[PDB]
Amino acid sequence: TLWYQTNYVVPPETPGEAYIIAMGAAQDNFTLKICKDTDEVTQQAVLQ
């Protein structure tokens, strides 16, 4: 959860709607054990 600490304070003649791009990765002690197939894929033919 992201919370407003104080506010988004802005001077006049400046847009009052800004954005945040959020990123993600893993640290230096990250591992993975058992290899399996992924569920992100479907297929119903042979791709002629």
Place this chain on the structure above:
Amino acid sequence: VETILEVNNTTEATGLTRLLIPVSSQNKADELCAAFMVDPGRIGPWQSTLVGQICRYYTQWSGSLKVTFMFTGSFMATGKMLVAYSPPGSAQPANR
């Protein structure tokens, strides 16, 4: 390698708008901006990363993670944000 989360995965965005989190000037204090689970391998924002797509080829991950927020407003806009991780045992926190 840091890749972008889709935190704004609602049914309204429909495009490249899905990658970014809106902020604005609030009338009340204490307010919430966004929220997402911490689960590489679950439906949600982590699914559009290299971590969340390689942890689907593998079972049983382990280790720490990191989330980097970049602010794309103007130069004159100022502010402060609180970014809080809460371990399991309960539901999403209701206030700051």
Place this chain on the structure above:
Amino acid sequence: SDRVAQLTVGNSSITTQEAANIVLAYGEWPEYCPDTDATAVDKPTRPDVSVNRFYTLDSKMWQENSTGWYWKFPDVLNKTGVFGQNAQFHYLYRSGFCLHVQCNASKFHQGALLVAVIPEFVIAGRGSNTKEAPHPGFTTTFPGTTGATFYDPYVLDSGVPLSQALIYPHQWINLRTNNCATVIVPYINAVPFDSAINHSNFGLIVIPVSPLKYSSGATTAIPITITIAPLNSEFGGLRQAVS
């Protein structure tokens, strides 16, 4: 290399990019009670992670006609977290603190706050009686997390002028220079251990000296958040809960 700082205490951390400096109150660091100054004969508890961390209070909106605010320490943390549970089961108490008041504003805003730390800050009553006499209520002396607004900030509600109140440990939040004030306070009391429920040691005070002014079109809502943290806290005299 001086405007940028990070303060990691416990499992929490505060960043800042527009700071001024960090003030030690009276040149000393909070430490544990030595054996040559202790008077109890039991062993104290020292949790050291679960109670030494940054607790964030609520936010105070700063307006045109604000006359200012005050909290009591450790009154505001007797009901939050595991510090609020160790300060109820235990009769005795000793700690330091590390305070941080955040208030940001743009390049077109102006004003200044006075963030000071007053040891043994006693609230006065407001009557012209020579004995009956008016005395402040319990929610005025010991306000809690919601603080209390001053009635007369010129005399600090204690018959003592603000113009000499820079003898206390303090900083300024000048909106053209910084956005945060940090004061680190040791344990200041005449006894080594004292109760955390009857006796609040000092009081944080944020008073806007020069008022908030902004031209038309700017952001009208300027909040003031306060994030505090105990340091080197230890308790004694285990019993049942008294709030």
Place this chain on the structure above:
Amino acid sequence: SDRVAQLTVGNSSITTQEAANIVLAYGEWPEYCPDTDATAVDKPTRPDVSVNRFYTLDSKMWQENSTGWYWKFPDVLNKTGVFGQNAQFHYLYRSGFCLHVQCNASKFHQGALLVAVIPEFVIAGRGSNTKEAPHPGFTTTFPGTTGATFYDPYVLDSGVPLSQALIYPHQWINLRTNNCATVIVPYINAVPFDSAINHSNFGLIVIPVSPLKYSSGATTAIPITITIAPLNSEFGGLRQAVS
């Protein structure tokens, strides 16, 4: 020099003058988690006085037709004291215990209790269904400070006979020999840290094997009190309260 003992833990102490011996469960002492077996990357809290002390539960009256009793640990201490507040704010948990069951009776009374410690004691349901099926309620599996009486003590309410239940760590309270049983138990779990709310590690069980008999005129009310104490307890993963 063997029937007399005193057990001082924290700010509390238990004397006894008619004891038998003290049993270490599986020959090992409760200790802290070493660095070669830890899997979390945060620093744990170790209060070490405020949570390591003898907590006295309520008393159970022992009658002619008692079929026996069971508590879950650390279920009974999640709501008492500062151990009950550290086990709610923290996700992780690790401790040992030191148990003590007091039951005195005169020289004209007779009977025997079986005070054992069963790791991972799973309650069974009591139906002849092969799938729906009966399952025990939450106040039967996790009873709390009031315990729960057995329905079928001959099979320990788990389809497993009492006659082989001396493989667990145990003592006897034979009313012609002793009046108290003491069992010291280390941390027995497949993971180094585990939650103190979902998972209760073991269960203390007091079952009268030979029944209480007394001639007419003797004192009819024989209670059984239980005084337990955590040892080398440490917590981790600070968050808000979940009971």
Place this chain on the structure above:
Amino acid sequence: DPVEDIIHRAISSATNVESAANTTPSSHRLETGRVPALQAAETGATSNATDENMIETRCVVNRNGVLETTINHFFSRSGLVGVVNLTDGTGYATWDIDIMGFVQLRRKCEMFTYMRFNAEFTFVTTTENGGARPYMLQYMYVPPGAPKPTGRDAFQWQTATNPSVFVKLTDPPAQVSVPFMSPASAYQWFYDGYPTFGQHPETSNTTYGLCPNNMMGTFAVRVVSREASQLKLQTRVYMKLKHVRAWVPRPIRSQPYLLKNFPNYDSSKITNSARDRSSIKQAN
């Protein structure tokens, strides 16, 4: 100089024992104060009276073997854990890998709480009339989270990442080795707890005792063909526990079994551990 009180072993001893214990010769005791026959069972310890101190014994050099009684030689005997029924004409069959369904190997494994082992599976597949028909089979292993196959010729049988075994019915039975695949440090057979947080009910909580550190996946099987052949099959899966370590012994089951995952029994029919006799004062 600072605060001072911030500054401030076991019992058992294992011995490599090869054969059974010997017996040393004894004599007669006529003296007071030294008694080996009087014990106290209330101390939680067993009796330590050896037979040299009760009677007069001789010198026996004992050469009996204590080798077959160890926990490796006791569990390295493969037994049946699951039977998968495949009737072709949905075309496939799955089996959630849970060995608590057959009772010969379950009761041996319920002596202990924590066990850490490797396995060695064997799949004996026959027809319903005895077997031996030259058709080709495929056995996939589906880990938790992987997509289970949803058809006889679906795309999950391409099997580019997870293991699979091709073997005919007329070959010798297939046999693999399986490592310790749990996320914890031991398989626990008794988990006194709940998997999730929340308000747990009183009537029927089907989650009490569910240990998710033991759920290891799904075993799928089909006949590698395009047109649906019409022949009914059964596989039988035999698990051999090897490299096994065990912790925290517990008493053995004495009541008749009911459900796979739950240790239920009926209270209206409790079978006695010892079968009855006429009276207490006669032995036969």
Place this chain on the structure above:
Amino acid sequence: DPVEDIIHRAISSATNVESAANTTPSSHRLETGRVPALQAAETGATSNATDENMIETRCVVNRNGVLETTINHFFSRSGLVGVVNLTDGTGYATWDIDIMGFVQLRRKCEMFTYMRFNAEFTFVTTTENGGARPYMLQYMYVPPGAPKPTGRDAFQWQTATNPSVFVKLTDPPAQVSVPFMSPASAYQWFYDGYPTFGQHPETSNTTYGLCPNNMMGTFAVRVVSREASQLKLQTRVYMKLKHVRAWVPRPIRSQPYLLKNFPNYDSSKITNSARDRSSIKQAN
């Protein structure tokens, strides 16, 4: 080898300063980057710009005294703390020892929060027309818990354990020394707290600010006689703070005083700290 993380100064510096500081000669600065006139008051520190770096100064060997400004020479001046009125014909008079009732010595003591001192009392007793009549007086000191006298010739004046002073009116005034008698380690003049537990009210809590570590007893006085002499008296008590140590300075009072124990003021008449002038742009 065990758990590792179980294993895991100041700023100011006092100097003995005898006289005031000197002044070294200076020159002119014509260079960039080095500026002593620019400060930042937001850092909570005072300005450190000395006068050698603002202007061009000369060499002054300064021989002024910084001796009379210390806290021992500032407080070792005895002032009035209490006036006890005795009218004979109940025959005696008491005085709860509280020096917060007279305003010359109170405001000097409100500069600091904690003070640790010895005292030296002096009792100047006169009649109402000036004094000097040869009658004999008795001054008892009643500690907290001791029985206060309840009559002119009661038995509490036997004075077998607690101190007392016999002196006539026509002698020089009596004078004693009094040690640090508090149970804490410092007299605190401002106690932000309540003495007891319980539910504290909202309307009128007369216990807020009461510090029981400062209540030191009762001072009683009578005329040592049997028949009631008829003469009105006043004593005046003068306290001299000696061997004094002080901690935690605070600002000086600027509002007019109201009650002894409570720091009350009226909000309808707040006196300004600086007396007014005509405008800001002229000095006189």
Place this chain on the structure above:
Amino acid sequence: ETGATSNATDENMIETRCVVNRNGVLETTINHFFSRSGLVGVVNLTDG
């Protein structure tokens, strides 16, 4: 914006303990990830 990822380790964010980590980073290499045979083609032969 510098094109680099974050280098903040978890010892510099919170207070951590000493953990001797013994997890395996062997099955995640590109040899153990691709040495698993999968289907690449189906050849249909009808004779007559």
